[PDB]
């Protein structure tokens, strides 16, 4: 109740966001005020319950939660921009070091998140927020859900999710991390579908229609519809500037088998990140201006 409002930022499906100041310390924060008779919004409670149990530099930190009857505002750290604005700005050059740095921060945050058994399930450039010091953070945990006990925007949705996977693991984030990666390389949405059919159509026309060797039991997913055998453009033609190590990372993130699809840890262990050049420091990442 000690936060003063400074600027309005936007409205969504769930809430409206305002830049705010903590009066006690003059700190800049983001207050997400949730816009019947079911009580407090389940999305706000989900974000609270998940972000209270997490603490990592690459995960958005819940700082406070206050409100009145059935209405609540959530106080997060203020993030200057997101990866969508970075990608869509034609005045910014995304060098391989910048792409590597974004990849590294996303994968480290995701590795901590998956180690604590939580799937983000809404990974996309606008959910990857950046601050004035270049630290990427996973945000918008309104869709995040713990995993381990026996979804996503269409463009970045994994094929298993697009094919109806009720139970899934880290791959549903990893695939999104792949798509973001591709969107970083092309400065354009890699697989901009229209329906759940067109998204899979683009996926299979670009990467090739998966077969049983590349993805066993793919036909057991509930919404599984079999497409045509598209050869798939070779990865070095789509990403003509990608090196062999980067192509290996892309191939790992875009494996149709989610079990074979590289987890965050083994993605971090790929030679692409340890190869030259090293990821650029966060303070030297491009700022959308």
């Amino acid at each position: 109740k000690r936060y003063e409002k400074l600027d309005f930022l936007g409205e969504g499906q769930f809430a409206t966001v305002y830049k705010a100041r903590d009066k006690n310390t003059n700190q800049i924060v983001a207050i997400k005020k949730i816009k019947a008779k079911d009580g407090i919004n389940r999305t706000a409670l989900r974000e609270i319950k998940l972000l209270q149990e997490l603490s990592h530099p690459n995960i958005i930190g819940l700082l406070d939660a206050f409100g009145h009857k059935s209405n609540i505002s959530l106080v997060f750290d203020f993030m200057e921009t997101d990866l969508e604005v970075i990608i869509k700005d034609n005045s910014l050059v995304l060098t391989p070091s910048h792409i590597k740095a974004y990849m590294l921060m996303t994968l480290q945050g995701l590795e901590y998140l998956h180690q604590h058994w939580i799937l983000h399930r809404d990974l996309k450039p606008n959910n990857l927020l950046l601050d004035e010091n270049g630290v990427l953070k996973l945000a918008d945990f309104g869709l995040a859900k713990s995993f381990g006990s026996p979804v996503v925007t269409r463009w970045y949705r994994a094929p298993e999710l697009l094919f109806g996977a009720r139970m899934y693991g880290v791959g549903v984030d990893m695939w999104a991390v792949g798509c973001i990666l591709a969107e970083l390389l092309l400065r354009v949405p890699f697989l901009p579908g229209d329906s759940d059919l067109d998204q899979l159509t683009r996926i299979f026309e670009t990467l090739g229609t998966p077969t049983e060797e590349q993805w066993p039991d793919m036909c057991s997913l509930p919404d599984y519809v079999t497409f045509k055998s598209f050869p798939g453009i070779p990865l070095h033609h789509i990403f003509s500037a990608a090196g062999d190590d980067l192509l290996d990372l892309i191939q790992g993130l875009f494996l149709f088998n989610p079990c074979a699809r590289i987890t965050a840890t083994q993605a971090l262990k790929m030679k692409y990140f340890s190869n030259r050049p090293g990821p650029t420091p966060g303070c030297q990442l491009p700022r959308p201006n």
Partner: peptide, 26 residues
Amino acid sequence: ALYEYQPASPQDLAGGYTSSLACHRA
């Protein structure tokens, strides 16, 4: 500065749930 690292039914298998995730969690 080079970075260096620092430390089920067929439906579930197709989705990425391998019955080892639950055992590791439990």
